[PDB]
Amino acid sequence: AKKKLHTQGHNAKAFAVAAPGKMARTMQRSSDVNERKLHVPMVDRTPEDDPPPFIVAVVGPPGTGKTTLIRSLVRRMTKSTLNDIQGPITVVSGKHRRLTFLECPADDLNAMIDIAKIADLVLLLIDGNFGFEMETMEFLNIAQHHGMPRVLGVATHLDLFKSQSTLRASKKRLKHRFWTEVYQGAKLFYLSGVINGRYPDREILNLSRFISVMKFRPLKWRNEHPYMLADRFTDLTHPELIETQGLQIDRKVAIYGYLHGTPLPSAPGTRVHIAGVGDFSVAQIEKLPDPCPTPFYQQKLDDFERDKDKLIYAPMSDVNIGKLIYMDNISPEECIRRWRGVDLEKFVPYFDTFEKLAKKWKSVDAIKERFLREMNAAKKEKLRAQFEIEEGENFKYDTWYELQKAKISKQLEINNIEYQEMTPEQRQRIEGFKAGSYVRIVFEKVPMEFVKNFNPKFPIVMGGLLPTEIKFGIVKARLRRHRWHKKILKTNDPLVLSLGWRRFQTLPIYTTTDSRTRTRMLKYTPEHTYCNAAFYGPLCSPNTPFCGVQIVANSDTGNGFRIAATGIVEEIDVNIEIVKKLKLVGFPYKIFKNTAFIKDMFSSAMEVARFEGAQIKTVSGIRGEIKRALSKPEGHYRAAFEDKILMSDIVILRSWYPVRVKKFYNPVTSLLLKEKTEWKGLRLTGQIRAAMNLE
Amino acid sequence: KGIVLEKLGIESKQPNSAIRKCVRVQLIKNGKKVTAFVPNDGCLNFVDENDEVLLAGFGRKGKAKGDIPGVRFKVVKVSGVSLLALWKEKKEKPR
């Protein structure tokens, strides 16, 4: 220990800690707190300048009442009592914040699945007296698989309970139950009463303040797909087109909303999917000034020029070389002649003749720029310059996560100094209607059912479809029975599933791998673990989580749990060879020692000859081969086993028969339907037998 | 805490072996990558990739027949919820 310490330049012994105990005990605790801070690195892709309204979506059982709850929150943030709230509504709550409420329907899983893909923040109210109904539990399960939003539960009906002691016990139970579903340490606010038609100001003020500092995290799906919520719905058709064609037309439709997530590209012709209608495409993109402008934002606009009464927006409810390049009339011959004043199939570009080049390249003095006391100083400087060129990349944080995070942060403001130079005209096209730009994008070929049966109470979103997602191939996913759901899932039995922006029923098939040598189909689902599966439908990215359900018609629910199948997707192709095992049974009719004659497995003596040399096995576990087609009866054959087969014994020849995937596809089209609950698709195998009275 | 890089031993035939249980996780605080048992093979259904796992010390007392020495670690929680809570169907995996 004497010379080991002295090896370093500084005295090793001189630097020491007064307490070993405190240094050591504190060191472990501090490190655990840090490791906890570290999380895998992500990308935001939401603008620093103009953020969209963070969508907050009240959900829950219907008899509790969420309409009166949202009216007691907008009347304490804008001091303007509302009435008969329907559809999405935007209110400015702060100097830079402005949330957008969205009353879900409680009755419709078709909209309950729809909303959780877009709700940035979800407010869940569970009746204090009735605890958690199925609709709350069903919504929480679907939200978690797609991507967990920030949840802030609340507990109405707290006032009713007769005894405070019983009420305190009930509050602890719900609080503890809520912790398991969400994250422990999260407490749902409790509202005592609605005597005046609104909650107490003190309880509401705490709830409004708690929501304001939410600071929601970035979901993976939302930073890959440009999405928006439709503020107001507008049909733009001539009534003369309607009166002539007689209500059969597909209507030209303008829709209005705030963009989100990623920049929706402004060249018209990107395809984009209404949740619950079908795959559409954009036709015209226009941006108009947002109705609700933050006061800090308004001040900047006023200063450049040199709205207090309306603090909310509820429309549904009642009150150069480059510009020489991108023209197509110019020829590229003319383009360079406009710039000064050939096929790409050959690889070597057009040079001049060696006569013209050798006379030009006698001297290399034009290109010598690109190669590598006062006088002495100069020399030194030169050397330094060369040293930097010779060893610059090799020569040029404490935690790896912080560094690799700098790969994102430096990547952010190198967009921003790039976009800033463009900004008035070039940036908008390059910007492509960035998130929160209140855009007017119009459609075409929207069906007649959508405008007729419409009510503003249900939402409608858009999913900017990636070119990956636009096709239709059979996908390899894996999934399990959702362990709340009682019955197990069946192969080739239709299942409504929400994959990507789309909701649809398809015919899955549940395919294990017999120790990774093939894809054998099962007939059912392994009732407690993930099985590898397959189904036709739209295509997506791999590592996309979906969450499939059974009967989504609210006419037929019962008290069972609705969500039945959850899982991710592994890979996608257009053909999976998929194998059902079949075995050919046979019986011996004359045995010997070590050689059998087996009957009625093969029909003809020619059928045996297609199969000779096949490794036959028995029930008893002995092996063998089948060798020659016996002639004088048409069916039988001689087969040599390894030991004396019995008469009581049943030979089985393993074999594999390929199957197919049935290519049924059915988007749910929920709000094209009139009643908009009780959309009934393909029935289950058990249900059809009862209807047709088969056994 | 660590990030699931990939799942070792998926191609093992013999179920609930020792080669099968291994996942290869890189630690977040160092970037060192390391292998860890995930107990009772049916658990492997819960971990996928990039799934924020807590590693612990495995620390067996006496060697088994087929164990792999050098598997230092065991996986306890994944996405914040316990594997033994998952395996007993108490909680569900958040995403």
Binding site: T517, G613, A614 | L8, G9, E11, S12, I19
Partner: peptide, 27 residues
């Protein structure tokens, strides 16, 4: 003909198997 396929692939799916196993054990 199916004998010469069923044998040859099964030999490949074992000769590729021990390589993929022994590449695990040494690492």
């Amino acid at each position: 003909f199916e004998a010469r396929q069923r044998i040859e692939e099964k030999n490949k799916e074992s000769s590729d198997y021990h390589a993929k196993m022994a590449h695990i054990v040494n690492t």
